[PDB]
């Protein structure tokens, strides 16, 4: 069924909450035993958001290999993503260790450091060229190279140095700065423009490690970003683009991380973004 008609049907009948609860009921349940170990309690932002054991990213250290992060591997679309929580004061060094070890080119951030008057993640990158950051627990140095501030997003060039080997790499930071404190955006236009800027940089392409994408918990806004990207790519690749089923793609993604898409409003917004984005993919 052409999702544009499915959309109008759900909208006229006002059944978004019913559709969304069906997804919640059918979603995979896999163990998350490592996340729940007592030694990892201060590595998790939220008690009810954890990576599954089978898909979690492991840090390359013998001490404690745990980070709240998951590998989402989309086989037909030939895309992979790492979805993670916003870093905590005690996990900023782990976060950049993961970026280094997984050979990522881009980091996608979908929240502000403060929202609703409370801290949603640590200030984990430097704000001034001449004030670099050193993460002593993981032996990394991070420098701000340049910053381009636009009306709806900011893009930063960063240098990450492995102090053990003195290798350096360029990381791109894509920061969507205008998601509202409550609800979802009224139009998907600026979010789609942002997605296309990430694509254009190479950060989603197979010559690099998976992009790292986060919000506060790494499931809601972050889920919307990867769901929209994968659905638009499948519409490009297939003979019959109307065969792409957004609910089926979301359930596939939920085999790899729990809770992706947090509200019925985020589900509607995901449909809207794919419908409006397709009017470029197809040929317009």
Per DSSP, the residues of 194-206 read: HHHHHHHTTTTST
Instruction: Establish whether 219 is an annotated binding residue.
Output: yes
Give me the phi and psi of 247, to 5 degrees please: -65, -40
CA 173: distance to chain centroid?
12
CA distance 223 to 56: 16
State the catalytic residues: 215
Two structure tokens written together for 72: 């989402």
Give me the phi and psi of 129, to 5 degrees please: -50, -50
Instruction: Establish whether 14 is an annotated binding residue.
Output: no
Alpha-carbon dihedral sign for residues 243, 245, 249, 251: negative
CA distance 93 to 26: 36
Q: Which experimental method was this entry solved with?
A: X-ray
Instruction: Establish whether 228 is an annotated binding residue.
Output: no
Helix (H) or strand (E) holding 146: strand 140-149
Query: How many folded domains does the chain comprise?
Result: 1
Instruction: Establish whether 43 is an annotated binding residue.
Output: no
Instruction: Establish whether 216 is an annotated binding residue.
Output: yes
Q: Are 258 and 27 in contact (CB under 8 A)?
A: yes
Instruction: Give residue 189's domain range.
Output: 1-284
Resolution in units of Å: 1.5
């Amino acid at each position: 069924m052409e999702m544009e008609k499915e959309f109008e049907q759900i909208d006229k009948s006002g059944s978004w909450a019913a559709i969304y609860q069906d997804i919640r009921h059918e979603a995979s349940d896999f163990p998350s035993r490592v996340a729940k170990l007592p030694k990892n309690k201060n590595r998790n932002r939220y008690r009810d958001v954890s990576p599954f054991d089978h898909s979690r990213i492991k840090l390359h250290q013998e001490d404690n290999d745990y980070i709240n992060a998951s590998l989402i591997k989309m086989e037909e679309a030939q895309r992979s993503y790492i979805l993670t929580q916003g870093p905590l004061p005690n996990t900023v060094g782990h976060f950049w260790e993961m970026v280094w070890e997984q050979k990522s080119r881009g980091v996608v951030m979908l929240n502000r450091v403060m929202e609703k008057g409370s801290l949603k993640c640590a200030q984990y990158w430097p704000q001034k060229e001449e004030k670099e950051m050193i993460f002593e627990d993981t032996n990394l140095k991070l420098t701000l190279i340049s910053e381009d501030i636009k009306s709806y997003y900011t893009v930063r060039q960063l240098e990450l140095e492995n102090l053990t080997t003195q290798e350096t790499r360029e990381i791109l930071h894509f920061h969507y700065t205008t998601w509202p404190d409550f609800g979802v955006p009224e139009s998907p236009a600026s979010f789609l423009n942002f997605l296309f800027k990430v694509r254009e940089s190479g950060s989603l392409s197979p010559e690099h490690g998976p992009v790292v994408v986060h919000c506060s918990a790494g499931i809601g806004r972050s889920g919307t970003f990867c769901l929209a990207d994968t659905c638009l790519l499948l519409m490009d690749k297939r003979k019959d683009p109307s065969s792409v089923d957004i609910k089926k793609v979301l359930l596939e993604m939920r085999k790899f991380r729990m809770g992706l898409i947090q509200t019925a409003d985020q589900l509607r917004f995901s449909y809207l973004a794919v419908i409006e984005g397709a009017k470029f993919i197809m040929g317009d």
